[PDB]
Amino acid sequence: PLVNIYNCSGVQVGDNNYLTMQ
Amino acid sequence: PLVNIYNCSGVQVGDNNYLTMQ
Amino acid sequence: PLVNIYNCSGVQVGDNNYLTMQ
C-alpha cells in the first residue's frame, strides 16, 4: 500500500504499461 | 491504496498506458 | 482508492493514455 517515495523522476507503482521517459 | 509519494516528477499509480516525459 | 500524493509534477492515477510532460 503506502510507498513514501519522494523520488525525483519517472515512476510507476505497478500495473501493465511500462512507462517511458528521456 | 494510500501512497504518500511527495515525489517531484512524472509518476503513475498504475494501469495501462505507460507515461512519457523528458 | 485514496492516494494522498502531494507530489509536485505530472501524475496519473491510472487508466489508458500514458501522460506526457517536459
Q: Determine contact, residues C21/A21, Cβ cutoff 8 Å.
A: no
Question: C3: which 3 cell numbers?
Answer: 492516494
CB contact set of C6 (below 8 Å; sequence gap of 6+): B4, B5, B6
The answer to whether the CB atoms of C18 and A20 lie below 8 A apart is: yes
The answer to whether the CB atoms of A19 and C14 lie below 8 A apart is: no
C3 vs A21, A22, B4, C22, CA distance in Å? 23, 26, 7, 24
The answer to whether the CB atoms of C5 and B6 lie below 8 A apart is: yes
- Write down the H helix ranges in B1-22: none
Documented resolution in Å: 4.2
Q: Which residues of B touch A (CB under 8 A)?
A: 1-22
